Design a protein around this ligand. Sequence first.
Ligand code: MG
Ligand code: MG
Ligand code: ZN
Ligand code: ZN
Lengths: 277, 50, 49, 79, 1362, 99, 49
Amino acid sequence: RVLDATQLYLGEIGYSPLLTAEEEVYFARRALRGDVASRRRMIESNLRLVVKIARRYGNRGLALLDLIEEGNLGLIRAVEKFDPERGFRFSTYATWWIRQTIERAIMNQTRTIRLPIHIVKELNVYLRTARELSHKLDHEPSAEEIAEQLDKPVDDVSRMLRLNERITSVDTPLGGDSEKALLDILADEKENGPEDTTQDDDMKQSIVKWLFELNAKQREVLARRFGLLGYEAATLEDVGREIGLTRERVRQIQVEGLRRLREILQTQGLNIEALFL
Amino acid sequence: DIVLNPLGVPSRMNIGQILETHLGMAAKGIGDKINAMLKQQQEVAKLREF
Amino acid sequence: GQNMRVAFMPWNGYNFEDSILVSERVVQEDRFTTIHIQELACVSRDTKL
Amino acid sequence: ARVTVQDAVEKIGNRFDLVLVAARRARQMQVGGKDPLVPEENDKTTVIALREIEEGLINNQILDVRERQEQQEQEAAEL
Amino acid sequence: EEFDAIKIALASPDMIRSWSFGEVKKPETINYRTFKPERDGLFCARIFGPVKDYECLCGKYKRLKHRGVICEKCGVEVTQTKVRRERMGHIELASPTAHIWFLKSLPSRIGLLLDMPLRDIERVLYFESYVVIEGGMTNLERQQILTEEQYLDALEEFGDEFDAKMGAEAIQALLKSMDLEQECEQLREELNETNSETKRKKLTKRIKLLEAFVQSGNKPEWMILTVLPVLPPDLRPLVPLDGGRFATSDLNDLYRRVINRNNRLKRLLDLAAPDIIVRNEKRMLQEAVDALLDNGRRGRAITGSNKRPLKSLADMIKGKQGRFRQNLLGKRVDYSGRSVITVGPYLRLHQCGLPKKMALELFKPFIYGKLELRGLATTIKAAKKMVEREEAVVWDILDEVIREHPVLLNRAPTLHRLGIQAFEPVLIEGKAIQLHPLVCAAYNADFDGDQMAVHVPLTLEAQLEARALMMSTNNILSPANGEPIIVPSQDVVLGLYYMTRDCVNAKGEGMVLTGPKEAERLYRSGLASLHARVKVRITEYEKDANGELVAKTSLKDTTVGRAILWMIVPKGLPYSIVNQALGKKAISKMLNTCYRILGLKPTVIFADQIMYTGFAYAARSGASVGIDDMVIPEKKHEIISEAEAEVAEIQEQFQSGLVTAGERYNKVIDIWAAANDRVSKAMMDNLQTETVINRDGQEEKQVSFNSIYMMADSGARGSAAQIRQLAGMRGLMAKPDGSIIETPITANFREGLNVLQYFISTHGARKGLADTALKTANSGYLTRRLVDVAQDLVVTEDDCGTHEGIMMTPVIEGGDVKEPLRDRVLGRVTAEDVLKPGTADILVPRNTLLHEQWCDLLEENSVDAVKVRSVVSCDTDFGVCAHCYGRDLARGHIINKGEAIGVIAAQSIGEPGTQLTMRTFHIGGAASRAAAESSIQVKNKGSIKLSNVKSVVNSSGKLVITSRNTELKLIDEFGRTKESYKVPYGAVLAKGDGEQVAGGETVANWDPHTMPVITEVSGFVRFTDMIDGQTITRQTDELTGLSSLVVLDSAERTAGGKDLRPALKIVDAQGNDVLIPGTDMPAQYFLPGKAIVQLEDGVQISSGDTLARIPQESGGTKDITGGLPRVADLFEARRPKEPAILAEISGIVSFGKETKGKRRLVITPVDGSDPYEEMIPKWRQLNVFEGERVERGDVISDGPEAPHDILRLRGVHAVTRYIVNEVQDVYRLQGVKINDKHIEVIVRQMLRKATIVNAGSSDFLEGEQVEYSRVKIANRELEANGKVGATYSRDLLGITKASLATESFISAASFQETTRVLTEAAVAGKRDELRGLKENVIVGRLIPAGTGYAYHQDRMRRRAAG
Amino acid sequence: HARSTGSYSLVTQQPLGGKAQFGGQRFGEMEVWALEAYGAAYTLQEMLTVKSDDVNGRTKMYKNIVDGNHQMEPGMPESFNVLLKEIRSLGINIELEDE
Amino acid sequence: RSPGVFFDSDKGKTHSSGKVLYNARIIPYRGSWLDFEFDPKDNLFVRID
RNA sequence: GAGUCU
DNA sequence: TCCGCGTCAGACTCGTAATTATAGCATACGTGAGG
DNA sequence: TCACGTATGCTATAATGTGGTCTGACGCGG
Ligand SMILES: [Mg+2]
Ligand SMILES: [Mg+2]
Ligand SMILES: [Zn+2]
Ligand SMILES: [Zn+2]
């Protein structure tokens, strides 16, 4: 017995009939015509080819059994759209599918933030150019050296090379054995600390008292425009919907509320003190 | 210049610091004699002898 | 480092447990004063915006 | 009371019930604004509470007496 | 929020979907350009929530105007971003996948329940072979594995007659079909016929499961997962690094593998692909799910980019870096800082220097609070800038808040509670903390750059807790030992020592002074030395029978300095206390005297005043350290040349081949070790009494005032041991092994070590410094284990009303009384009414504290032993009573209700092991054993009194002992044990039993480097099972040919003579055996391994002759490192390799039948006519000689006692005394002071559980071990109401097991074994009601002890009353 | 080094570590046993909740101290809430059965 | 550890009897290890890597 | 990974 | 007896931030704006 | 109805079973 998933699947596909020339045509003839037995024993037989193609495309994106799975899906589409009428072989035709299905599925799953087909194939043109430039410019090629070789924008070469930058994992230690990782250092900036939390409570509870302080028509008109006491942040012209119904008198009364409040901030001890903030 | 604790020596058993101090004293003692003879401006043959 | 006149004797427990009592004159001479050159970088990056 | 809290402990008994009684009285002067019995002498509400326990003025039972007095007086103004 | 308890169960497929708020059907995280949650991704906003507060993705609905609004466009709820860490999700797996915790975590759970091996289940999972779920005709057995070939057999023949399937589907259908009610009945009924041990163990565990599985409401279906839940996004975040790079958790990478393989599987099932392809995908799904849950468990862990494995979910719960140990039982804390500490010798004991800028950042909110009250700042933002500018007004307010506001100071490592103490801050100029010198001992803080942590107690409760409990002035005595930890050292001792000590004439001898102030007057005036003998008038206040102080004036013959020191001494102490020359040991007794006479206040002032004057006079003295102060004796080269010739003599006799290598090795070490003693005795004799002075008479002598000597004699720093290495001889250095290097260093540090002497010194240097780094972890792990078991234990009750206790005889071991009765019995409730010798008037009441006053009366009347109320003997169910524990050793008075004894007890044991691993290791270089115990010399006259001794007279005319544990007492005039010794086997006594001896008489004599085998009969020697080459070896010399025989053991022995036992059989002149007097035992002494024999076969012998000489190589210097494993093993309750056999029931012995050497004992007691039989090995020579009235727990085989056999036969008090004495002897070897009550605390927790033998009237019945506390609460109701009484037996448990046996699974999972605890609790459906401290520390509640004791019991009456 | 209030970690929601990050001090299990042993349960609960994880506790307590009132208004650490979700994601029902 | 052959022995760590089981290791700079070792019952055995 | 206090 | 799994002291300071490789072009699929 | 990024699709010489670390220890089950 062997309890490894890989050497077990490899044992199963081993005891499978390696098809000859008109054996492929004989089964594929009834496969396109639609046969239970043909599709299985064509696919079952040609699993041995998938493994070899998947073996060469390794240490790149997925592990290995993952390349075989996506490789087997390409072999199934090779069988659905094979043409036995043509004198050409199946191993020729299916090699195009298994290299294709694996290339195309690696491009998607290999990265954490999902990178599309266009941006990746864009990138491969820049990468193969870089290797040709590197052998004659000894040092690695710059983004301008690559951009200037293809006569394409410097921002476009920079954009795509920036997406190539891989993601560092949080659980990875800087220390070594068991000191600290990146979660132990990186701050939650979305949750503000008690100092910043209580300042907006004190700023906004200070303002609730300064509303009751100014005149009755001035703190009504000023508050409901900014949406401080009211429900929606309206404009000078939209304060007319309430009771004001004015354009000029609203603008004079809004500014009159702010002018009396500017002197309330110069006396309490802010104005230029709270201008820096 | 510095006042050290003598009780930081016997427990530690690092007596080289005390031999360093004694010899360091002797070393400065020669320096302070030569410094005095250069201030007094005695003689090149005298500095040679000492 | 630097060599200096050292007297081995206790002193009002200011040399309690290997605690050291140094003269103002050593600090005045700036002889144990150390230079610390410090490197801080300012980077203009490219954000989404 | 300043450094040494032994005399305060000798008066109640338990070191733990002492912290509970002293805190109760500290919180009355902190929020409620009750007047201190011993001269303040510029000390924190924590030390006043210990001083009052040390002298034998504040106690779990005495605090319940005085709480019932203020509570039930207001209950009588209602009823 | 508030709640009662927490419960664990299996997640039903139905239950997993309830937590989920959407299915993640895609592995996509974020769009690379527009950085947002993807469509039904891992970080989907539609499922887990919006990124900003109250904002949908598209941005149609913003802020609280739209409160509970789910956007129609993007599909996102307008709620707080908080919902992203709280909402979970799910994945509908196309095929079932086994949960790895309910498969691999042995016992297998899924396998134990199916009664099907784990190997057999895995074959089904990875699709190797089919399993029959329900074979219609019983041709195919249930749970029978069929191979892929064997499946094809049944398929054609039967077909539908059987339902055998493969994969997790088959194991789930197999768990579905099984009936727990029907199989459980069958297991019960079919156990009756056989009744063995391992069947009844495994079949009863299966019954316990099946019953618990039903009652837990769990189904065996849920062992296999059909649904897979998803962690919330914020808990596995994809956040941006400052630069454009991002970072993600390892769970995102494992979730993506599972979703990819699940989606691909659904597509391959849609494609109706061949099963070969489908199987591979099902295997990969199991691998990805098992890797998500627990990565490194089933197979090789899935590594990511870094080569390290991806951290799984289990990993963030399990072990050290799990949530429990790192983010829940311990925390990062606000209002904390640290810095380099330095001295503060001006400070008072209740004070500490706290830097300006530290205190400014520490007390920020209190400053903003005062700034609004004084009217200086309008808002907090305004107050923030005032403080940031560091305005002059702000320093004044900072000063205002800090007065009377304590700060906590902490040092690593926090070994005991005194590692944190509270102080009143003093603002200082610099950036460094100033620590009070006297508390330095508790922290173990030397100023060579230590750092100490600062904590602000914010709440008023915390300010009062800091001031009342944790204040430095409140914490003077050690909780470990009733002795002051606040004790002057270093300069302070040296200064009072220099002050008090007298000297010949000096300035102004035989003067007469008016008072202690005129003594200071003549000293400061410069007319008298501190050492001048002078008559002085001093008035001492001694305390009367009542509280009042009585004043007494008298002329005192003391020095000037002693008069000056009396000024510090408070009124209450006699003048006799400062009349001696004071050292460290005496000054410690001064504050202990003062604490018990006066109180706390006087001691705090006295301790300070001692500190101040001690430092000051140390500085006055100008005591120093020079190279001339290290005097070497003139006769050192004389001693070495003699000792060199002695060692050269044994080495020359070794070349001849007279003495062996092992004998020379031990013999040479004894010569050098005594030479080091000789040089050191000559050094301290030429150092101590070297000062010879001329008095005003003619000439006399006194102790030397050599500066180094004063420093070691006073006990300020160093000792005579260190001075050997400085002036005398360096000594034998220790190998890294522990064994002693044969060449010791002759030279010392003043003379200087040469190239080789240094190289030898380094062997022992590195090994010491190595234990300081490595072995501290074995010791510190003991601290941890001890705390987890004792954790929950708190004083609950005032008085249990129990009448029981442990009888404490005084530890008189090895000549001098090592620990008086007084010390051991002090601060303990008198269990029974213990009066004076004349039993006719009670002397001490049964329920009374043992104050030093009562303890002094015990010495007057000579109370020998006293029964004392112990913690173990408490009959409290809930915790322990105040009476049973007795005095809080730290406080010197009765312990309070609510104080947590468990943790205090664990810390007191754990601390000295842990810290002493770092103490004599950094300091340690040299080896200094002296295990050359050749002979006992009795010191007082007495009658010789042996016990547990069986000797026989020899040819010489000498009482030779033939018993292993022989003790020798020393009986005085009236009849009481004064001295006690261990006389070993084969020892020669001077006088036999009952004979009078004088003082200074060698009463016993023997050879230490050999364990002889001595005969009991006379005649000739016969060789039995002593074949040359198989069992023994042989080596001869020359001319004549003397050969020695060396017995080989199983190590140096072939497979030929393994079951052969080599023994020197005794025979007479005829050739027959010689019977041992009064027994049917033919004389036969079994020789063990490596036993050297000089007498060959056919040699005449008398009784008392030595047959063979077993070597005794133990040259290891016993430090903490060699004793701690012993302590660990005792607390863990491990049987040794050779446990001594003990008699189970009292009655008449009859020896029985035999098995080819192995003995049987069919003992038939007088009352119990039914017999008890037990097998005994061949080689164990028995102490009991058969046909004898033997009682419970009588030593039959000699050797070490299993603590299980002690508790089983001789009750609780016996095993408690075994653990206390055995553990404490290890700490006593190292001079570590731990009260017995602290060991007794942990022993109580070891004696937690109990196995129920006879049936009860509940659901205990038989075999089920339950806690002691629970079965007694049942027995209280049973004794009154009636029905079947439950007979019981208390079981002993090790620490690691007793901790896991606790009902609180949260305590268990936080300790160790996190993976196993959670699964066993999940399947039993256990509910933890949060009992102990760990549970409430986790949930972030008030401790149910200490200050919160009162609060937790107040909630408990709310629960009772409705 | 010294810190009153500062940044908080992402998952644990505890203070950061070290002066390099301006972080609070670690109060380990060793340090927890000390206050356990004394009896000071308020000193401990302070450091377990309002100084550490308790989000409503830390902001509210900051405001209590600025108001002057040194009031203990605690809750339950977010690190426990994390433990619950991490155990539930393992496929283990863990729930708060209340009073 | 230098490459080459090095003979070594578990003293009393192997087994309960304390049979000193002698062993050998041929250590290359690159390639598989070659171990030879005894058993309690004095039979020679081979293990690679 | 290199340190600092035990 | 042999294989497997489980533990292994407590804080602190610093320091840095990597690699690979996936072809090329034509119709198909979805949303938003403009006529 | 195009504009634009994203996705799906097909290539016919034959090709058909995979390939980093190597040493802990002391305890305690099954
Ligand atoms: Mg020191
Ligand atoms: Mg230190
Ligand atoms: Zn929307
Ligand atoms: Zn009791």
